[PDB]
Design a protein around this ligand. Structure first.
Ligand code: 6PC
Ligand code: 6PC
Ligand code: 6PC
Ligand code: 6PC
Ligand code: ZN
Ligand code: ZN
Ligand code: ZN
Ligand code: ZN
Lengths: 298, 299, 298, 298
């Protein structure tokens, strides 16, 4: 059963049990859903509606332009080198480009700014729960992530349109995320996101007004492997356009990333590096195995 | 943390148990090991090496340079992670040989390759029997699983990794695990390059004169229920030196049924049961992506 | 000005003028277009439509698989030994293989059979006009071409898909045709076929519901050089997929080919041979000079 | 310091810094000189000699004729509506008139033809360097310039003879060039060409065996203002006849010119139009401000 965490149970004497659920999702799933997370359901509903309307208005034509430009009109053999995906990226931190994206509406930009700020505070709240579960001092992960200019925080807004031949192409090929903590607002009707657990692909179930959390490669390093970043993918379907609004809380470019000493006894197998060196490498090898990227930092 | 070198002549004597134990440790903890004092005549190895290197210089080097310019890798500017800096051709031995159909090979190279391949096929089957004994399986178990209808698949990849002006930019061969059963490598004894991933570090598979490098593929990880894992490996380039590689792949037949051996399965396995050719059709397209999704895809 | 022959003008006031124009194209161009040729325009439209749809369904992915098979994905330097071409061949005579091309529909097969029979009749009508212009007896060329089983007649169905760098590769390299008379139904929008005349490449202009005629090597022999087989090529372009349905009316395999004695005063420089010996040679040297093939038949 | 670019440094490890100099000149100067290009110094020396000898034999007459019919022999006060200039034009593409200029010698025409071909290839190589610096796809600008008949390429051969009172008249009044890329072989002793930069007229220094490059109005549109076409003029002097051999690589007449979409964020201030409409208008208003010509294309 996929972990669903009720964050409102942290405000009372059920808080220890909630923390234990968070910790075991972090150790064994790499993913969990959160409900009662404090984000207004009214804000999620308009983010959802304006994301979908901005797709028809602005992204659908770019998407078909892409399928023509790569011959994906007609899928007669398996395509393992492209994602059946429509995306644009919004940067929040350290410097916002929200007011420079030309094709987004005023009210969409205002909703995205509010949504991004609330998710940034929720990311930092979640990192503190991780710290507590890890036996780290409060604020430890936030301070590691800061670097010189503060954390990097952006939002990937994706749609995975219907695919006539889902067997032939993935919406997004299997990978682990490079960063710190990932907070996903996904479609509540159209499924597609899957994680790999114990040798099976497991669906990340659509759930109304929920946020999906998962941990990236940097948290595997800092926890000395105690919390691993898990492989995940998006599969297409013939009917349905799955919406994806995923926010990435990453260390600053010059943050020093290393295994926390209190989590290391035997010499660590994980490297110590500067985050931007990891991200330069990751961009070119995102869909290749994760383990060579750690070795490359030594 | 020393790379395992196994003396196969010590299986013939009082030290056979200690030698078997060493083999089993390499299979569990390295996925690779070198063997010495195997049956292969050192003069046949010297001939194979000599004729491979001369066939590169004579027939492949001009094609390799032409491939460079056709792809614009003659001048390297930024990292290339979708191309291998590699010159290769393939020789199929089983189930059906294509040796007499490679046009650009000499009669003496073709005859030596046929002889070399036959000896390596017999050595592959002897090594599979050592694994069976170490795993507690009946003798011939892995050979029988691999047979399918037409027998095992056996072929040889003959590769050269020529000097690369900028090695930090392109791999000789990107990191992957091998799809098949057991892989037997005769590699350059001077020029290094092959590396395996162990405990979060890339480790050189050291060139060693008249040795054979053994490693296990994805099919043995399934059959042993994860006890022997298929290990990630790559070939790095260098500015000088052309590393030769003659690698033989002993794989199950196309219609072989692959599954975890029942005596190694005390609770539900995380590994699938499938037909080998379905794994291979999938593997061809995703060879340089993670291994674990390929097992999940067989369920 | 590229010769366009109006076959309705044989009926016949300008019939001398039309015949003189046919003769002038045969001597000096080796190519000419015909209009009002009797082929139903609706049959041409069906052939064109089903040819273009059959490419998309059956050849376009085969074509992209061939490109990556041969490395023409990257055209960083000149390719002089490959044609940027998708083709299949249909034999009508003496023995049809129309029923063995498996990925074609019964409607396409029935239309090609009707089209091929009408083009075979037009080929023989055209050969009789050449006979008259040359002063040969009616039916002379048809009788020479017959051999024992009748003429050889087949259709090459080609498409020349768009090429990102057309200056690196030809759709089809310069050559002369080996056979008798060639009747080409080409794309009426996308140009590409060129002939060599007076040291210049001249486009063979797309013209709706027209047939392009050219003379092959066998007619150069029979006419003792009075009508020469002209070099031609197909150039690629970056946008546009030029279709080509080209039918070859050739002598039978065991036909005896020699210069017609009434066209020879001074001893001929052209050989006398059996057609299949010419064709067995031509296959290996099609894109090398034409003149050594005549010498090789002595 | 006026930018001088060594093109031979593109073949090696200094190529990035060379590209950076090119991009800097394109953004901030609109002009740059190139050395070590492909043109043989003996071809430049012969072009220069035969241009100067062609002035004395053929153009000096037409020039004094011009001064007659305009009353410019004596300059009592400023002349702001005529250029103190002797010119004839050579067209290369899409069609050459080189063999139709009556008063040009055989060897001048052969040199002029070889010179023009090398400058046409150098124009296209330079346009690809701009593409790379702009982040556009390789060949982007050449493809935009093509239209139906290919680029327009011609050569303006000018002399600016000595002027008794240079204060009264310009050799060529201040203007921006209408076209794409301009490649100038100018006098290496007699100066005169100036550009306007940061509120100062700056001399374009004569330099042995160099080519002066500048960008026209069409590249400002395509780059959405990132590379502007800058005002330039030729001043006269009392002693010295400055030679000017200027080749203009322009889009084809029916080319569609618009800001490249990857260079546009907010709505562009530049129009989208067909090049020949710009040229019709430019011809009549060449020495008036540039900005109204862009406004006129909307
Ligand atoms: O696009 C991704 O990589 C993604 C999106 C949401 C959650 C995890 N990963
Ligand atoms: O080419 C390979 O994948 C290979 C070759 C030799 C040994 C292991 N792997
Ligand atoms: O494919 C050919 O060689 C051909 C096709 C049409 C017309 C002339 N020649
Ligand atoms: O005559 C011109 O307008 C010109 C000549 C050379 C360079 C720039 N402009
Ligand atoms: Zn992800
Ligand atoms: Zn391998
Ligand atoms: Zn032909
Ligand atoms: Zn100018």
């Amino acid at each position: 059963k996929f972990p669903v965490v009720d964050l409102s149970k942290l405000n009372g004497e059920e808080r220890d049990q909630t923390m234990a659920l968070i910790n075991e999702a972090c150790e064994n799933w790499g993913f969990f859903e959160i409900v009662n997370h404090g984000l207004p359901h009214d804000l999620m509903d308009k983010i959802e509606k304006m994301t979908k309307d901005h797709y028809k208005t602005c992204q659908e034509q770019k998407f078909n332009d892409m399928l023509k430009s790569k011959g994906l009109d007609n899928l007669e053999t398996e395509v393992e080198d492209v994602d059946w995906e429509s995306t644009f990226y919004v940067r929040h931190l350290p410097q916002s480009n929200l007011n420079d994206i030309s094709d987004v509406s005023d009210e969409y930009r205002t909703a995205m700014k509010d949504f991004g700020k609330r998710l940034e505070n929720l990311a930092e709240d979640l990192l503190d729960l991780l710290c507590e579960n890890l036996g780290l001092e409060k604020g430890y992960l936030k301070k590691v992530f800061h670097g010189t200019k503060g954390p990097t925080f952006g939002t990937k807004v994706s749609n995975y349109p219907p695919c006539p031949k889902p067997e032939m192409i993935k919406g997004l090929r299997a990978h682990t995320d490079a960063g710190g903590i990932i907070l996903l607002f996904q479609d509540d009707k159209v499924s597609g996101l899957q994680l790999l657990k114990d040798g099976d692909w497991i669906d990340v179930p659509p759930l109304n007004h929920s946020i999906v959390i998962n941990l990236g490669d940097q948290l595997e390093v800092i926890t000395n492997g105690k919390y691993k970043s898990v492989l995940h993918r998006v599969v297409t379907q013939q009917e349905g356009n799955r919406m994806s609004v995923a926010s990435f809380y990453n260390p600053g470019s010059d943050a020093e990333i290393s295994p926390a000493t209190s989590l290391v006894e035997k010499d660590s197998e994980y490297p110590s590096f500067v985050f931007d060196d990891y991200m330069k490498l990751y961009a070119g090898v995102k869909f290749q195995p994760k383990e060579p990227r750690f070795a490359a930092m030594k």
